[PDB]
């Protein structure tokens, strides 16, 4: 059979954090006990910048300049810390998409190298023809 349906295009995405207890020699406040990296990337670390313009990570208010804008790949940031907290993640798509910001969050994990990584997909419903061309450009 055949039927008309809303257009949908999916793009695989990997996001989350890694963490490691810091050794003898520290990088950095003395209070800090862990090194951690929060990130958004593609599978096999393939480029995602062709449909993602920038990624903004908002850290806890205890961090200086908690709004960290990463406007070029790799869309990640490495920091030091002592505590676990919720990091707000805003994904901005390229201007061709004419899309609202994609908002989600990730709970930074430091305790059971520790890692908290998700392998999901971003679903674009009703994309415009131009952004569709970009998404299909692979």
């Amino acid at each position: 059979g055949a039927r008309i349906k809303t257009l949908s295009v999916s793009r695989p995405i990997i996001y989350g954090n890694t963490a490691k207890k810091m050794g003898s020699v520290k990088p950095a406040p003395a209070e800090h006990t862990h090194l951690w990296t929060i990130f958004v990337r593609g599978p096999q670390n393939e480029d995602i910048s062709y449909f993602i313009k920038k990624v903004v990570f908002k850290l806890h208010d205890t961090y200086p300049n908690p709004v960290r804008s990463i406007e070029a790949p790799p869309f990640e940031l490495t920091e030091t810390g002592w505590g676990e907290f919720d990091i707000n993640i805003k994904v901005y798509f390229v201007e061709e998409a004419n899309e609202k910001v994609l908002n989600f969050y990730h709970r930074l994990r430091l305790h059971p190298e520790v890692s908290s990584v998700y392998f999901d997909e971003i679903v674009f419903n009703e994309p415009n023809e131009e952004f569709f061309k970009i998404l299909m450009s692979r």
Binding site: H60, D61, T62, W82, G83, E84, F85, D86, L110
Partner: peptide, 8 residues
């Protein structure tokens, strides 16, 4: 106020 402890 947002929570931030050694472990959540």
């Amino acid at each position: 106020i947002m929570p931030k402890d050694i472990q959540l």
